[PDB]
Write a protein that binds this ligand. Structure first.
Ligand SMILES: C[C@]1(CS(=O)(=O)N2CCN(c3ncc(OCc4cccc(C#N)c4)cn3)CC2)NC(=O)NC1=O
Ligand SMILES: C[C@]1(CS(=O)(=O)N2CCN(c3ncc(OCc4cccc(C#N)c4)cn3)CC2)NC(=O)NC1=O
Ligand SMILES: [Ca+2]
Ligand SMILES: [Ca+2]
Ligand SMILES: [Ca+2]
Ligand SMILES: [Ca+2]
Ligand code: NA
Ligand code: NA
Ligand SMILES: [Zn+2]
Ligand SMILES: [Zn+2]
Ligand SMILES: [Zn+2]
Ligand SMILES: [Zn+2]
Lengths: 165, 166
């Protein structure tokens, strides 16, 4: 027999993601670079591996959308809600949605897609919010990034450290 | 930091369920009898007790639906996904949804409701799938053709590992 796991997490270390569509604000390359970097934040401190799928069903389906876009968490136009992601699980579990009424950037302007995506993928992997004000998972946006210690401690609690050197 | 915490077992032994609606395929009496029996499988070998509520909120809300039916885990028409249930917890936790594009039966012409429900309630109580090929929680539907169902030992051991014996 098997009882359900203690915590919500992926039962496998090899995870796929798919960029379903793209924002007007950045090139395909810029969007791809930002998400690859944001996944690397987490894979660097765990045994998790992330591979991009161009089509088909991936574990973490990424999309840009506005207002009602197919779930119980409609977006709200510019500012306010920037994005959201669902905890590990089947179907919409793990998926990350970005509000395309925001201006997404690879820089300090608008909202940095990398930074917001890194926070989102924290959710996709099983982290909720932190009370550590320096944490990536501290639910307030601010802008060489290094994953703060609270976030490392949190993610490793779920997946272990993987290779430590 | 915080993780998403998972209620590994119900912290109370007395649980409620509500049959929110009913399949076209069986009488109300047949459906009530199937679910009652499905709960009895688990209460027979633990201290868990199940009470039926007719109105309002219950721990385990039972409903029949098709396609997209309120949780964004849509059903898929005849065959394939037959049903699903949520692990223990508040709100959706414990609830069991049955795809009414399936033919549900008291006997063998379609999917036996009692059998699938017993599996579902295993999930509602905190059991994942077993690798024991004879287990109720082994994820392939089979039908013995026997009037009596005996909960396989693997499932007994599993459920007892959370709630203990009766
Ligand atoms: C519900 C909501 C609202 S939301 O859509 O408004 N939301 C998303 C993005 N989020 C955020 N993103 C990046 C952050 O990094 C902080 C940081 C740490 C260290 C260095 C640097 C640097 N340099 C930055 C922090 N918080 C703010 C909250 N959506 C959701 O997914 N969570 C939610 O709270
Ligand atoms: C995801 C899915 C798919 S599903 O909807 O297709 N699914 C439900 C039902 N399930 C099943 N139900 C009854 C069983 O009893 C076995 C048994 C043992 C001993 C004697 C007799 C006898 N007589 C029977 C076995 N497996 C098969 C898988 N949904 C879900 O809740 N789990 C899932 O795998
Ligand atoms: Ca997913
Ligand atoms: Ca917004
Ligand atoms: Ca419930
Ligand atoms: Ca089906
Ligand atoms: Na935009
Ligand atoms: Na039916
Ligand atoms: Zn969404
Ligand atoms: Zn967040
Ligand atoms: Zn459902
Ligand atoms: Zn199952």
């Amino acid at each position: 027999y098997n009882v359900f796991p203690r915590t919500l997490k992926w039962s496998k270390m090899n995870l796929t993601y798919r960029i379903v569509n793209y924002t007007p604000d950045m090139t395909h390359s810029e969007v791809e670079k930002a998400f690859k970097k944001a996944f690397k934040v987490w894979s660097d401190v765990t045994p998790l591996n992330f591979t991009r799928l161009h089509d088909g069903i991936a574990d973490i389906m990424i999309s840009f959308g506005i207002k009602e876009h197919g779930d119980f968490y409609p977006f709200d136009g510019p500012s306010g809600l920037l994005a959201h992601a669902f905890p590990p699980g089947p179907n919409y579990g793990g998926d990350a949605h970005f509000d395309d009424d925001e201006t997404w950037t690879s820089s300090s302007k608008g909202y940095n897609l990398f930074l917001v995506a890194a926070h989102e993928f924290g959710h996709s992997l099983g982290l909720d919010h932190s009370k550590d004000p320096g944490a990536l998972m501290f639910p307030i946006y601010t802008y060489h990034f290094m994953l703060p210690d609270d976030d490392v401690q949190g993610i490793q609690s779920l997946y272990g450290p993987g290779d430590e050197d």
